[PDB]
Symmetry: D2
Subunit: 295 residues, 4 copies
């Protein structure tokens, strides 16, 4: 047998960084979880117990904290590119660095209507993520995402006109609840290297803001024919709003809220126009995926 | 052998309710998870396979949905009181109903600076909870809480002058990170029954808002001597601002953020006044608890 | 305002210990998660920023590791008793130590039908737990438990003859699935102190083994009238088999498996005697509790 | 813009099936979680609100329960192939069915040393999984796996000879703890369709048994030079033992157990040969991946 593929490194590296403006006393905090996996001429660590080719996962962990000390950790697209570039440049025999970052929310507190200089709240488990693949000779491939953005609308969702056969029980509806956990990913044009990533740094925060704003507005305002039709509208707007993105991907659960027929109890009316009380369904869930690109 | 205590019922009952204003078109959503456990003359269900005494957990589930249909689900102190009162009043042999409610956040979306009439975001995993114990002959005992309120301050936390002996390694500090998940409970004066709960309804939302505001402002503004000293100031203020509360209880983890000595690497300075990059510790954690009452 | 209750210490302390027999080469591993909370004359740490009274949670953490180094970590009732006794004996102003231990399974691997000397599998998420409350002047109160013991029987469960009224939809059944996660606790007679705990050491492993054996055999063999009736028979037998236990407590979810009527599809029969395919329900769940003591 | 890729369906479908031998009274239970995602000529559901092309996720859920009623649910490779084949054959415009199955453990109880006819224990959260991709014109691609197999050895693990530079702090060791959660995947030769999958049905259970046996024996017996070197030995043995597999993939966390220097406390010796008490590290973790094929 032979090694067809291999990658290794350190996962679940928790990092915090603080910025202190000594002039204003304003502090800004950043918290992330980092994974770095390396590829290269490392076959022999698997086949021949040749540890000489292994940059120790412990050393990869140290390198994450050192890089965080010596560079901005924002935007995560840039930090990931710096960290990935370090490994392929430092080590002749390392040819790819795969850097995943989950960014945790620390939103500045407003106390008596003024932003507090050094106190933060985790407003939601919503994440901002990157996958940065730094490949020697093939530049830097960046996927950006937001995930765990949990939303519900109580009307202006519909689902009718779907295929009906001997497997179908679902009633058509012209008025339902729609609730999802938004996972939205935008795939950047290939970058030639760290210089080109740096040249575009402001577009990262901007495009995340756009993706989040388009997601929330389209969800709120679309009189939805389906998850499919609504998610496509989000993707096409994001593409129209950032030329450097090639594709937008959505992965959306349909988190069902079922009507509860109470007519067995004192003729209580709680269906159709009378529906007030619903049973949120933990499982199963619809799962709807799309990747949208330019025509 | 004999039954010394027994309670039974339905846990993890997910409930959603919508209110629709037909004049303004504005919709408001409520989502909770409910547990109801019953006590009474039920020992024979355990000792003698006497199911005649069981109000089926399935029937308790139906009753939660029916009660939500026929009553306001807010504030949760009132809904719990109504639900618990139902069981002890309806069934001669049921003498206690223990109602736990977890309220899930659905915060109205602002789209283009305007509140949306029917679109919501889960803006934190923070919960608002009640435990309502309805006991025949002994009234209604309510504990109200907020939980999952995750906060961090980057400075204006200290920990020095603790006991130092042969078990002590911790360095004194005059400037550290403090981060916690706030679990805060306020225990109401005993209520005689549902009428007395109804007479205090506005105080529930008001006291929750006070508890949250005091928590956030005190956390942000206190130059903290310890978790102990800071949580005590929160509890004090809440007691001073609602005379119908007997006690305020805090349970606070100390979610440690450790400095990282990088001086082994090219003499990099990242401790004391140079500390920028920290290692968030998943475990272990300080756990600090208080119950504060009136002098 | 005044402190009515306070306790503080270190939670989520992960501990591993290995025993190595140098003669046989056989190694034995223990892994636990420990929480120690202290009470005593500590109110001034809350009211007056008086840290002089705090045994640092960091120091409690060190003490857990040192105690594990200097004593057996098994049975957990003994280790907890030793750990708790340390704090109240060492520190004049500490009057109570509350020790919780979760024991993680590391079961020796059988390789080619032979027990391996140093290789282990986590063969369930089932835990063995203790809560050891060491209170100066009032001895040592131990609750022992098994939890996370997940079981299912496919028949020989029934539920009929429960109360039927206008809230009732549940059909009587003489043949259903029963599945639960067993949480079983046995409360020991108060011990005068560490000497008395040491005098009963063999009874801890023996009573845990009895509790587990009775749970499994009674679950498997009882033609169950209800969760209530089955859990009571378990508690009875355990009380009858260890006179040093005062009470046995069960907390059992009813993890519902619902029949699926498929008769709408080509007249497929999948209910009653034809029931083969079921929908496991994540939520809600029955929750049935008992505490059984001696007549 | 345009749809580059799309797939949709139902996730987290919990299924239970029982087999009853009426002759012997022996019952056998199976429990799984199923996901089915469909591809085909469905672009217009996204682009034009054309729901005519949507087989409702609700209908996909019904189809899972009907297929489970009408077919064996074991081995999961076969059930997945039947379920996937159903969608591409039933619907002209559906061209691929992607079927993921997680199999949950229900191990028959031994009561007084005899296997019980209808009582089961969940021995471990270890899963057996399949990914079955049924693609019209391109046959059936099956990945089989075991996951969540949690193991530890207390010695006969080493890690020395790794690269040392200005980023390295890790001490070489000739005797450490090694603990992992095994995720092992074997990729089958492409099958032309359901007939060819059926022709190989016994190899599925056999190859799972082999994979699990090789994993446990190699882990227990290898005097490990690294995770890399040990996982490669497992993969090469599985390939040698089943000709119909093309690749074996392992993904292994290195779940670190750190020594605790206690020499600051009464010169306590707990390092190197004296190491008894360790701190299990929740995070970060080494992550080591390999895909092995034939040379
Ligand atoms: O088995 C190991 N492999 C590695 O790559 C590694 N790096 N640090 N420790 C390690 N252990
Ligand atoms: O065993 C049971 N106990 C109960 O109290 C119950 N209620 N519904 N189903 C039930 N099953
Ligand atoms: O605020 C704190 N309280 C404590 O009791 C403590 N112990 N270690 N660190 C601490 N921080
Ligand atoms: O938005 C929806 N899309 C679907 O594909 C679907 N299927 N059932 N319900 C549904 N809702
Ligand atoms: Ar960070
Ligand atoms: Ar959507
Ligand atoms: Ar609700
Ligand atoms: Ar605090
Ligand atoms: Ar241990
Ligand atoms: Ar039971
Ligand atoms: Ar199944
Ligand atoms: Ar391994
Ligand atoms: Na390189
Ligand atoms: Na009553
Ligand atoms: Na004492
Ligand atoms: Na087809």
């Amino acid at each position: 047998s032979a090694v067809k593929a291999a990658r290794y490194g350190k996962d679940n590296v928790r990092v915090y960084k603080v910025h202190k403006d000594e002039k204003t006393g304003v502090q800004t905090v950043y918290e992330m979880t980092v994974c770095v996996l390396l590829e290269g001429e490392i076959e022999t660590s698997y086949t021949k117990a040749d540890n000489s080719v292994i940059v120790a996962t412990d050393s990869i962990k140290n390198t994450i904290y050192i890089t965080a000390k010596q560079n901005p950790v924002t935007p995560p697209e840039l930090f990931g590119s710096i960290l990935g570039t370090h490994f392929i440049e430092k080590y002749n025999h390392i040819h790819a660095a795969h850097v995943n970052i989950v960014c945790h929310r620390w939103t500045r507190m407003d106390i008596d209507g003024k932003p507090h200089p050094h106190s933060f709240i985790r407003d939601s488990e919503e994440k901002r993520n990157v996958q940065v693949d730094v490949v020697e000779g093939k530049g830097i491939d960046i996927k950006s995402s937001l995930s765990g953005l949990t939303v519900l609308k109580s009307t202006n969702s519909q689902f009718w006109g779907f295929l009906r056969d001997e497997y179908t029980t679902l009633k058509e509806t012209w008025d339902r609840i729609l609730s999802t956990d938004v996972d939205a990913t935008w795939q950047w044009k290939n970058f030639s290297g760290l210089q080109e990533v740096r040249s575009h740094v402001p577009k990262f925060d901007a495009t995340w803001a756009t993706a989040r704003e388009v997601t929330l507005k389209t969800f709120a305002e679309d009189n939805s024919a389906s998850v499919q039709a609504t998610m496509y509208k989000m993707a096409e707007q994001i593409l129209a709003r950032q030329q450097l993105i090639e594709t937008v991907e959505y992965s959306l659960p349909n988190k069902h809220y079922f009507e509860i027929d109470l007519s067995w109890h004192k003729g209580l009316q709680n269906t159709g126009k009378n529906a007030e009380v619903f049973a949120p369904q933990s499982d199963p869930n619809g799962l709807i995926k799309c990747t949208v690109g330019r025509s």
